[PDB]
């Protein structure tokens, strides 16, 4: 479909989100908005220096996203 529709179909699935500054957020996509801002939960984040940590919920704006890795 159109990229945004593909993103909406990943709602409920695990997605990987790589930001423009190199942070990697991986977790369950709860909701993507029209501008690709994504609400994710139970995430695992890899920061720029390689530090790995976890967070219960994050809100990643679409303008901060390099790419998203979706299921299938």
């Amino acid at each position: 479909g159109v990229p945004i529709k593909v993103l909406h179909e990943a709602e409920g699935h695990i997605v990987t989100c790589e930001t423009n500054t190199g942070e990697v957020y991986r977790g369950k996509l709860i909701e993507a908005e029209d501008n690709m801002n994504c609400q994710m939960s139970n995430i695992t984040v890899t920061y720029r220096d390689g530090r790995v940590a976890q967070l219960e919920q994050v809100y990643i704006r679409g303008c901060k996203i390099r790419f998203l890795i979706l299921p299938d």
Partner: protein, 81 residues
């Protein structure tokens, strides 16, 4: 742009920093956000140390939604699989 013709073909999508996303082009939009299936990212890195040679990194990604704001160039890499 004229991109509906390129659907299902293998494309080389280059970001402003030179990262090269190679995948099967499945979707796009006015902002240039792309859907690239069976996608890999390639980077060519030139070390700060001048006695070391340029090196390469490859990451196998999969089904990728690539944001158009960073996309600067797109070339045909090969026909549709």
């Amino acid at each position: 742009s004229k991109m509906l013709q390129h659907i299902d073909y293998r494309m080389r999508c280059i970001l402003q920093d030179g990262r090269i996303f190679i995948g099967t082009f499945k979707a796009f939009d006015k902002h240039m956000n792309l859907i690239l299936c069976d996608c890999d990212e390639f980077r060519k890195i030139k070390p700060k140390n001048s006695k070391q040679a340029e090196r390469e990194e490859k990451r196998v990604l999969g089904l990728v939604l690539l944001r158009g704001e960073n996309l600067v160039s797109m070339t045909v890499e090969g026909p549709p699989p």
